[PDB]
């Protein structure tokens, strides 16, 4: 079978975590323009027939809680799963409003053995976040 | 059996180790481009090819504008990481 089966009754969930405002504790700036991102994504995946859920300004613990809860639903009639993360980050790390969370902790909930109603189905993670402090100066073509 | 890490795809906005860029009014370069490409190609292109068009859009059409010379005239490439086992067509 060369193509994923995408004619289940539902395309799947599309979870959007939109972190804009961070705790003074963290010294990270507000992420202006991300509401534009979050609304664009909502509309785009609505048009693809995903059941979209937008979440704003979540702590690390709220992110972990949500992803665990979501991974424990019955995805049996869903074709796929999509998660979008819009935040600050470091390499392998996404920020809740109050601190860092390992991306591996988020995605492990959806592992083939840990979320059986998504076993064999595409699990898409879309990550808008930095991955370090390197700058690409580019090259003239 | 299949691997427990199979059938994931991680569409990163930027390459390992690098900053990722966001326009204060229009949103992030990556998400802007991802939505435009999905809007225009989700009914005709496999997802990896859509994501490749996103890479080209980010790489060619965006360049940072900043009052801080340190952060001015910079570029960005997204990073597609696929552990997928099949092709993905949204239609």
């Amino acid at each position: 079978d060369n193509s994923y089966k995408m004619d289940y009754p539902e395309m799947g969930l599309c979870i959007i975590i939109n972190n804009k405002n961070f705790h003074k504790s963290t010294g990270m700036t507000s992420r202006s323009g991300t509401d534009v991102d979050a609304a664009n994504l909502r509309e785009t995946f609505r048009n693809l027939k995903y059941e979209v859920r937008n979440k704003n300004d979540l702590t690390r613990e709220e992110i972990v809680e949500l992803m665990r809860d979501v991974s424990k639903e019955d995805h049996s009639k869903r074709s796929s799963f999509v998660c979008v993360l819009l935040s600050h980050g470091e390499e392998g790390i996404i920020f809740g409003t109050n601190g860092p969370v390992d991306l591996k902790k988020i995605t492990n909930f959806f592992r083939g053995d840990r979320c059986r109603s998504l076993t064999g189905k595409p699990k898409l993670f879309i990550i808008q976040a930095c991955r370090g402090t390197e700058l690409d100066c580019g090259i003239e073509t | 059996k299949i691997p427990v890490e199979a059938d994931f795809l991680y569409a990163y906005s930027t390459a390992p180790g690098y900053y990722s860029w966001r326009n204060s009014k229009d949103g992030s370069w990556f998400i802007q481009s991802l939505c435009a490409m999905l809007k225009q190609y989700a009914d005709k292109l496999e997802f990896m090819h859509i994501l490749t068009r996103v890479n080209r859009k980010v790489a060619t059409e965006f360049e940072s504008f900043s009052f801080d010379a340190t952060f001015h005239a910079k570029k960005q490439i997204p990073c597609i990481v696929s552990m997928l086992t099949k092709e993905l067509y949204f239609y």
Partner: peptide, 5 residues
């Protein structure tokens, strides 16, 4: 302007 996250 553009900024980094």
């Amino acid at each position: 302007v553009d900024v980094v996250d």
